[PDB]
Symmetry: C3
Subunit: 345 residues, 3 copies
Amino acid sequence: DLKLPRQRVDLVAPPFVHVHEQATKQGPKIMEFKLVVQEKKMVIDEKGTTFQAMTFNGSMPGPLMVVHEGDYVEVTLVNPATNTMPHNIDFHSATGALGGGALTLINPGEQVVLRWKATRTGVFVYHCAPGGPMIPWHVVSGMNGAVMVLPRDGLNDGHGHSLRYDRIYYIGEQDLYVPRDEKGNFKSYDSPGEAYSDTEEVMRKLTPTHVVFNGKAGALTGKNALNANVGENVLIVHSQANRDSRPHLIGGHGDYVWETGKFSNAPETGLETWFIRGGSAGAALYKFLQPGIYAYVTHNLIEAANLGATAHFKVEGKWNDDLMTQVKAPADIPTGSTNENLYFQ
Amino acid sequence: DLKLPRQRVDLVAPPFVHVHEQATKQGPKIMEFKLVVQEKKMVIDEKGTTFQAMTFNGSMPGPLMVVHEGDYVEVTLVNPATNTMPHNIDFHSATGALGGGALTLINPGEQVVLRWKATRTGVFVYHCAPGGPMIPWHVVSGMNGAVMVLPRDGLNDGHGHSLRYDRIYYIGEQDLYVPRDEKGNFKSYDSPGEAYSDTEEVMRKLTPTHVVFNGKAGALTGKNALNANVGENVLIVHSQANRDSRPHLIGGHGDYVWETGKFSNAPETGLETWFIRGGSAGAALYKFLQPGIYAYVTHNLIEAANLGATAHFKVEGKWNDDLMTQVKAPADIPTGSTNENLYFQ
Amino acid sequence: DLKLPRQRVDLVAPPFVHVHEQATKQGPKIMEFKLVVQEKKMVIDEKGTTFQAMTFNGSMPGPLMVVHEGDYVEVTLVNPATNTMPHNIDFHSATGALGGGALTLINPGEQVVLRWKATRTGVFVYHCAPGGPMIPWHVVSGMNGAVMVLPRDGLNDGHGHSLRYDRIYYIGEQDLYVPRDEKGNFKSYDSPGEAYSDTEEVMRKLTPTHVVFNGKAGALTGKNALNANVGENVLIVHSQANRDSRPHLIGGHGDYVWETGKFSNAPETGLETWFIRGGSAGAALYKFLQPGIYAYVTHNLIEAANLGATAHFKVEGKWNDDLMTQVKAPADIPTGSTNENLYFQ
Ligand SMILES: OC[C@H]1O[C@@](CO)(O[C@H]2O[C@H](CO)[C@@H](O)[C@H](O)[C@H]2O)[C@@H](O)[C@@H]1O
Ligand SMILES: OC[C@H]1O[C@@](CO)(O[C@H]2O[C@H](CO)[C@@H](O)[C@H](O)[C@H]2O)[C@@H](O)[C@@H]1O
Ligand SMILES: OC[C@H]1O[C@@](CO)(O[C@H]2O[C@H](CO)[C@@H](O)[C@H](O)[C@H]2O)[C@@H](O)[C@@H]1O
Ligand SMILES: [Cu+2]
Ligand SMILES: [Cu+2]
Ligand SMILES: [Cu+2]
Ligand SMILES: [Cu+2]
Ligand SMILES: [Cu+2]
Ligand SMILES: [Cu+2]
């Protein structure tokens, strides 16, 4: 009895996002998405450590889904008979039934269809939540993604001026808890079930062994650096389903930041580092002003450099010597300089 | 020489709150409260683990005290001779003398009366603070609560519209540090004094063994679930005196959230997860739109599911199929479905 | 080809700040600062524990640099030949080249001159960032400070009223990771190089051994307490380059707080505890209303009392009995009192 145009959306693998319009004059639609659970071993660091992962659509994070305020979202969740455990899905964007968790529990070999109305604008987390201690275990094993619900008029700056992005990326950050053997080496398992008890012991101490973007250390570095151009307005959506994060664009700023991730609230301007609370998504706009390599990190630098949480942007364009310049290149300290006279010696 | 009506308030045990008016046309009063320290063993988890607790009024958290801006708050603190240690009280709502800590130090068998003026609106923490390493130890042993100072006109949305709650609850979150024996079992002690040295060693590593609401794992689940009704505006006050928290209503939102907890600042709207900084109280409004069970958690899910930090709301009313509906119940995956053709396989 | 007045600034050791104007009618200048790297052993706690530190200008934190929006900042970085490692500098206030890190790498015996334009107002972190795992190691060894870029009209309250401070202090908070021997005693090293491998193992677990303000436990207590007077508006700038902090003035409030530290955003009013995200600086105003000792802490009380993160303010003036008063000093509990009748017994 819900009589609205339907539209099928094909999701893509993060950090890219499926095609969508920002501002729209189209009325409300039923937007149809399909997610298939996949349990599999994945590599999570540059030394080749492996991990028994559980994913939506084979990726960590799950794909970003984009709809407009007032749309209805109809999700088919599929749990193929190759999987070993029950799974479900809960959307933080949705209202009732534990975000839909209470309506979507499916055994291997089954599927379910849930519909929810997109009544609140912003970016939101979605994750598996089977019940009890299964909940943290599914989420930290990789079963979490995000949804963005745009206002029909697109983003604005909270002072009645429109904001438009040229480019969008979705960075999902994941905390992982990998057991070690007596000698400190990471342990390997043949199934998720088998990893469980040792993993639980690591989770209980609340300290991750890895903190990764897009599912592995180095995933968004080297040849998979993110691309941009001087002058472009880039939206970066950042989610963390379980633990806090402090995103920082090294060499840049957050021009407009919705750190709690909800478009009904005016963004903050000109931030250096912002804060994603565990269990939420945030979004930041930035207009690149200078070419070159930028590092996008969590600004716990131990986690960024040593546990895996660094992505790269490669930005093409012309350098602006007004903003920054090397006045004098590295040179010998002058013989006639007197730094030994300074207050602190 | 302070000539104002006096009024005695009877406190109640959390998560309930003593009777009060929201908006008031009464002038400033002296509001008189009494707190009695109690040291005692308490059960803190579902396996029956016990802990040497120190409390105000026998509860963790201490009772919520509610007054209006401009009131004077006169607190009698009582330390009965059955207790073993000196205690005091500091209010984050108050100005001077370390929030009153410097005026309220009492040995067992003594009492003291402090008066402070409620000049700043919001929710605030109160806690014991005897001096030095005693401070964290008293607080994490349970000696902390909150006070709410309402504007005389009641809450507003920051755009000049009144906000009124139908129902209020106070959730105090507590981090606990319970020593373990060689074999990993939790240790038991006959006095707070005796637990001290082993507890200090656990505190120094900054990782709690339990994170509980209203003093124990499961305290606000089962038969002590919180009650509400579709349509009701519920205020949830959340405090954490020592460590950060990220509250999340599973299946719901924060309609209006004062995450730093101060009513002079306009609330944020439509949050998924909010953030209580350690050493503070926050407050969130929500109007229930759907019946059923909701879980209120910190959205570090390891802490929520495995360390104790989950409460339940049971909400009566009629389900709204517009907001959310199960279109197709769990069913076998169709033989003629082709999920093996999807981008991620 | 940049034709502007130059002005040399002499930095001073934190928590004090070099002389500057708040509001200015002067046009843009080139502001010239010099920083010299110093590697040396420092004492970091009250038991005399030592640590292989790396600093800018011999202090942890580095000096606060103050300029106005539109100024150009020209920094000479000097790495004397007594040091053992390459170092550089990155400013979060600057745009491009990893905040200048990519232009400032200097070996011992060398110096470099970088110029950046101060286009964004607020307080910002600066830190060494040589590349890879060297980055967290340099920062947590002490190589980080802050810069404040003031609006030309000075601070305002976000509702078009001017804010002026009578007094400014810079509190840099530092997380430290000191290795322990088998018996739990802190280990000593003869060089930074030698401490490295053991320090890395401690950093990987993400739990600091010390959390200190101005470079050591007790640095801003006793005879080095900070000074103020009843009636004065004091600006406290707080930075943390690597880990989150929750500042709290015990006995006071944050009258006006820029917790994300950026002056383009209206401050919050009347906070009890605020939140500095790791990798950022924040600023808070407060007008002292009462004389006496105040403690400025991070409100993780374990860290404040047990790991080193407490400073003192000593405030002169007259006590205001209206705001707070001891109505009845500590006294025996009356024989005819009946506390045994209270709801919680
Ligand atoms: O109190 C009525 C009773 O109805 C139940 C049956 O399980 O379901 C209601 O809520 C569901 C979502 O939780 C809807 O799918 C269903 O249509 C609705 O009738 C119970 O939840 C509830 O106890
Ligand atoms: O500098 C004056 C001197 O007076 C003291 C005496 O202890 O107390 C003042 O402040 C108290 C609260 O801290 C008030 O109770 C008292 O009435 C007031 O005179 C000292 O704190 C201070 O050194
Ligand atoms: O793409 C052009 C090329 O120029 C380089 C040479 O290293 O430098 C540009 O950016 C520098 C700052 O990163 C400026 O100092 C320099 O003036 C500018 O030409 C490369 O970064 C870049 O690949
Ligand atoms: Cu699952
Ligand atoms: Cu969730
Ligand atoms: Cu106490
Ligand atoms: Cu406190
Ligand atoms: Cu360095
Ligand atoms: Cu940085």
